Amino acid sequence: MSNPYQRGPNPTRSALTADGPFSVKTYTISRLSVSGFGGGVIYYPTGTSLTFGGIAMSPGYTADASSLAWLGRRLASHGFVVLVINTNSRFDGPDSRASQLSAALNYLRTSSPSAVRARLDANRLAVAGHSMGGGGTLRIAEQNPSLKAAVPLTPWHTDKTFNTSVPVLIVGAEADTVAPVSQHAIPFYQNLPSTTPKVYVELCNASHIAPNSPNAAISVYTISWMKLWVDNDTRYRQFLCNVNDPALCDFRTNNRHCQ
Template identity: 30%
Template structure:
């Protein structure tokens, strides 16, 4: 589990709430609704007081929630309470007016009580399945800052539009070691710079996944541990850089927990939005660029398009590295001037982004290491490359594309440095992103490692590899990695 560092009390409260997956107000509403149902079965002497107290708690919490925002998970709770109220209040009103109170026989009341209890219990179950994500506390010595930039490459036309004057633009979010912010500093919104941007991105991710948008109302409500535009840490010297490309349809923030953990250990992480490929990209002028990627139903055509998209992403990664170099030299204004060590750079990615990272490493010798998070290599011209590589994969099963593992092994063997393939037991494809923090804990979707441990295993393996390859820290990397799964080591002189 994560090591606890010095944090404010509200972080400890968040850790308690994440176990419940409900806010204190929501928990009170559920408690009030359940107590209202159960009051009918209490002795007559205490029934009125319990009913009044439960009703007061329910009404007050529901009133406050109506102001702060009611999540869809609370609707069955409120519906169950609404069905219960007339039956709970009617005896009290009769008693006040002096009329005789009548109670339904228990065998008539029991089905209604069971039905209302079941309806109310649906709320906590839905909150557990689709929670507001609470991000694990970073374990490094540094606080984490974040900022967003938008860069346009004047030398590359935008191939996704018909405008011959349109040039390729990418949106980049940096997570970096920062000075500790004052107590109460507002932490960064998840999925966007603002609430509306976060909701736009969340809705787009739901559409891309084929889900109703309301199911993913949790992520845009979440805040991370980073603080926007926090001052860069005074210590740490020049900081190694990690570039990240998300999965197909993914967004720059999809690995926020991973990025914050790396930043807390002294790395600068640059996550990319790839317009027309990412589900939604909100540009600086307010325009939203939605994905143009869609399955054609033809496997060969889809593979061809994925290969083209991977090539565009590889070029985006090289372009961003160039712009980071200019930022470090002061050619672009920014607080990270003079702090970015662009001689120590890793290129990483998840899924299609992992394939793009491998291709970028082969094409651009400025990258010093490459990490592929369960991505299919799609480089049309696989040739030897000099960087050490780490490939993290889910367990290979009968449903895995039969071409995946042979192609991945072939590419890893092309490295002229020692490379590693780590298969993590219990992992699924979405284990390697933030998905386990807010999606239903169904093993076929997010794996069986659990919400917090999914992030822990992926970040721990990543940090071990980066510390060895970029910081040249001593130690047996193979021994460290093997603690997290089934490890295969591919050495340059090993033909097998």
């Protein structure tokens, strides 16, 4: 127990495909109660006095927080404070989603409820997002180098070029007709600096909405990336290194996360 941010028992793959060691509750942020974003839902651990890193997550174009509810709960149950935003407008673009992730992280750190701040290490924050929300995750990673990690899920953006040192794991869906991996996920991955720890995983046969319902692969890779970088939890390298996963139809890395 030398790593002060290490939470929960030694992981196994099967444990990372279900809700984790911590009971979770939600707090609903009303649209009117906050500026810079449209409110959302915070998933956070209960039955514990411990603190955890925080994650701000963005849904995609025309979607709301409930499109990632399963994943907010899944991540929180593994030992995170997870804020899934609603946008000011369902029709906000990827850069507007980055700004709203920025406002959500500031909110988490500065004016979230006492119940949430007691479970939060506001020094250890990360971002994730679906589609345009994934585009927003890449934009904010370029702007804020204190972010511990970025996980764009079936991401979409017109900008194909991001400069960040924030470790990025991108999830592509093989059969994605909305944000095709050849035009979105893969160029994002390839155009990221060669010196940035980066991973691309492609889900065999998966559609653009794979992230919107429970998905064993998204669970394993998202928990593992957030554990490794938000908590410095090297016990999660085993799921990100030497990867032989039949759910995947592509895998690319520059191998800066295994040592």
